[model samples]
Target chain A: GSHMVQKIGILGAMREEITPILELFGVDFEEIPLGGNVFHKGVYHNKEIIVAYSKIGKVHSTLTTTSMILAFGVQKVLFSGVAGSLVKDLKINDLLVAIQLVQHDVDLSAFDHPLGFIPESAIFIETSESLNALAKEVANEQHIVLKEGVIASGDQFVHSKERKEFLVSEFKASAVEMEGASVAFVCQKFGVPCCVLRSISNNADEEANMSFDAFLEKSAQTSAKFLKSMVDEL
Target chain B: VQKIGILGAMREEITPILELFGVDFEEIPLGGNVFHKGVYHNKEIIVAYSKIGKVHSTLTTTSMILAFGVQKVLFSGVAGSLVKDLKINDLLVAIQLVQHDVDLSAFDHPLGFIPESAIFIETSESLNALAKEVANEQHIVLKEGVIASGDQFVHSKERKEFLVSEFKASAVEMEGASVAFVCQKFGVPCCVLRSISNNADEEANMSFDAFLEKSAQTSAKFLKSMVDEL
Candidate 1:
């Protein structure tokens, strides 16, 4: 009888990043499949939520955001995942709320188009300020040290020092991942307010899988707490 | 004639195009792509070898329109036939384009949909009309229906069936839908035309490789005439 319940769409790129959130807040246990991906519509802190994970990369994550907007009619979107740190200040398990996002891999320079800048479309997709403020407040309350900066996304995993230096110098990005910019781009196109947050999983210049593997669980837990607070506030 | 944009995924797809513009165009190598700008049938145009995949295709489309100030765009390439009527070396124009691999059905969306936007991006009315007139005048067999695109090469029979069953796509390729998406966003009229080279089954790879040049050349001849009318 209460179809009036509002819903928020929460997303992650990896199952490890989303599992803890689902365990803590997910109720109703309803699962639905769309293509190869699955969606969970449940309740968290009395708030209706739709949780899903994009496999990875630009187009793949785009598929996730559109569903949340068009299918679930979500009022807001919050994307959480782990990212490699491009700067020294961001270390393992530190939460980062994206002030803006870009796809660093995009290069149309031959035609004078800047990197990440799509003609008649997006270059740097900015997130909602309210969500930034709220994320800051919540992280402070949770005793988590969360920083805010630009997050660059691409299809590559990014584990080289040369690549890291170029990304930092070019975009001044603080963090890098495989999907943030794309998620923000979709939300922006739909006129939907969205937030992209990340937990620093590794430095860009070292062995990836091991560092990512070690940090994922702790990162997920921290993310769950931050998201829980966001649900409560909403 | 107004300035037009021509896009192809490979050199083979645009070989005849470049040949048509012979000595009239300048090759500008930038960003791992080559754009040839010159005159065709008294019309100014930019032809780009956009490479493959959705991301690369979309960017090239945007670059053509934005950089060259193209009033209209015609994307020419080869695709895998999903239906029986379309055959190797036959041409097919897009009535609408969809990203078949994009599935968001859990949200009540159709298989090819991108949420609040559209599942199928429609081709330009005038451009399609022009293509039809030229195709008919040239005595070419050019079918017009939904063309599906994704990052995948679409070799599996199951995937072919999925596209035809879900979106009733007559053809599948790697870049048309995304190129159309960009053109739509830019408010520029666009048309996607393809030459079928394979059946999009398990044996697709061999068929596509064998017929790639021939099929691409077939479509190129038609495109040459389409430009003549433009």
Candidate 2:
């Protein structure tokens, strides 16, 4: 019998459901709730790690990541959440590993500059190749269909064809989520490695409401099982 | 409600002038230069010698403007050559400041500079023009120019030449650009007046201690003479 020590982090939308997943892995975690953000710290497979909910937006994600980095010296972060599937093949319960994150809201015209849409340096803030490789291996071992590509992050809850087509045509993003860019921003500043693993909860289309209601809970459980198994391996 | 003049610089080139103006010079706790606060020529003027470099200058200048309601600020110091004709002791008055530290390699915008603000500021032209007039009356030659400011101290001939070639800088100093930044943000009129203390060339033979006191006296007298108008 052998045990391993590693630092792992989990970010999700709810504490109640997410806590049960950690418990299933027999991990003892410390829970800290501050403002709208909450962080759970504990030994996962005898390694120091933290799990927390970044509420549900860009600001929350950024503030939580900053607090974690400053308080616990977290060198790496994993954002586990549910996303609306933008591409047709990304069905409910399919997991996504964000290779890159781009801001859909980065407007260039209002500022009236050529690079106003987004600064050139902003595109380089994606997850590094090494981290992406590790995540891909972890996904294969867990038997999860983890697709790697760009995930668009924005403040808006997108449900329009124009928005989806705009992102697909412009940035070639595969999915849309709220917190990935903020997660990337903090990770970039702290020199930490970050990856966004999202389970598709809905088809990102005009009929988003129906798709969301039908697949939300099942998708959560699917992602939860994969997270628990990953925790065990760590 | 008093108009204050706080000078941020990295060295002691301007301390004598501040002292001669009856200022009780005090060292800034965070290092760099000395700050003097008191009435000069019966008008309230708070002066600080901010040791060279842009960050040091920016922090000190912004603090001064915010801590004390500095309605107007004047930086009396020295600069290196951006102009070939700016001989030793020739006074340089700043009409505008362009932050040479502003790098447009990233995105193109008016406020493309870090810290998110435009890199230029229109100094108190009337006050500047008056200061030059006073200098002329006192037999000190004054030249108004655009000072390019940056984090590095200008002492190398190659560096000065590069700055002049790239930025169209007529003069060079560390603090003028940051001073303009703070002034523009706070809606305060700011000006920088400098005397050429060095050539900023490879054949540099300028002695700051040799002529600093005399030059300070000259600048102090000129500033003192402008009390009524200020």
Candidate 3:
């Protein structure tokens, strides 16, 4: 073959999130290191895919996206991980798809910027509609209780009820995580289509510590399952 | 007493920050970085040897703000001179910071603009002003201008020219813009300072090796003085 189709970059922050997808390809994946992290390039269901463990936080995630973009020229990206539910309806293990992404912690209103505004762009960054549509389709077929809404990201993990309340009030976010918006930001910067898929593991409250630990494995697998299914439609 | 945070990319750059604290500082490790806490001139300073690049620096800055609750942040290190006036060992105070490698141009946005974000992060004016005042009082040779940051070490003529032509970056390094980004997000004031260690070019490797020691010393002296003023 003269060439391969532009690949889709699968990104996740924690090991539990990326493990299942990497396992899908089994021995088919080749390891590629970039920007201080390991990436796996391989064919999944005849689809060109690269799996990256894009460590926690915005900076690391964005840096990893840039590296993957530079390395494989991945034309599209999808992040699969666990998040904390900002609202009561987003139950644990519920698939929370990002219709829009924002960094809840970014506050530059003092400088006439809107909440989460980074200047030169909108406070709310929309995700790929094609990807979102496929996600909904897969959710319907898979019997997954999927909900789509704004997902806010930041460096700190939301643990208290007050913090989650602030995020809900400030961004009207349905879920909160650390890497979604930053990943979307870089993807859009490179003209790459992107989507963020998360499975809620906790309520982002005081019991989040216990809840996250209890549901992390299950939630990670849940999002990974959807992510794998989404790859097939690409 | 006031709380301040100081960050550097390398041990050579960090040694100066530690010297400001003298012998009573405590060392703590987090996320592959080290933070040294001490008090100097009523300023409780947390100095972190954050290692290289934008990603590592962001971790240190976020931890410094969230975990330690620093009121202010200062990032001091060495950068390659993008302009002719910024010679080896000369000081540059970053009033404005940007990522030279950030290109959202595909989206019809300006170079350096992080979509849904800022392209140029203006460092806290009070902090930059204080740094300049300190330099003036110390009779230090310093110029205030834009400093660009990226994940790579600049060591090419074309890349250096690109930084200048694209962002008007007077100097380039791996961490300043990120440091500013975290500070702005957390609402903590930050200042970035660098001493030119090389010209980003074919000769950069040799020049950086030759001037790193001197540049480290120069930056260290300035940061130490800033702590005193605080």
Report candidate 2's fraction of native contacts: 0.00
C-alpha RMSD values across all candidates: 13.2, 15.2, 17.8
**Candidate 3 residues A1-234, lDDT tens each?**
216765889999877889988886575788876445788988766668889877666776866776667567677899999999988889999998899998776543423556776433567888899999999998898887789999998766678888888899989999988789878876775578898999999898878778988998899998998998888777
Q: What DockQ was computed for model 2?
A: 0.02
Best by lDDT: 3
lDDT of 1 by residue, B30-53 (tens): 434678888765788889867766
Candidate 3 residue-pair clash tally: 1
Query: Sorted by lDDT, highest first, which candidate order results?
Result: 3, 1, 2
**Per-residue CA lDDT of candidate 2, range B108-206, in tens?**
333214322344567887778788777767786778888887544455677677777766678776667766665665567777877776676644434
Deviation from native of the Cα of residue A233 in model 3, angstroms: 1.7
| lDDT for A20 (candidate 2) | 51
TM-score of chain B of each: 0.95, 0.81, 0.96
Q: Rank by TM-score, highest first.
A: 1, 3, 2
Q: Write the per-residue lDDT of candidate 2 for residues A1-234, one digit (tens) a residue.
A: 024355666666555436556666565666776433567777755568777765544434655565566555566777776788789888888988888787565433322422203322354247756766766787888666778888987645666788789878877888887678767755764467776777888767777666766776677677777666555554
Q: Considering only N, C-alpha and C atoms within 3 Å, which residue pairs clash in candidate 3?
A: A118-B117
TM-score, model 2 to reference: 0.49
Residue A214 of model 1, lDDT score: 81
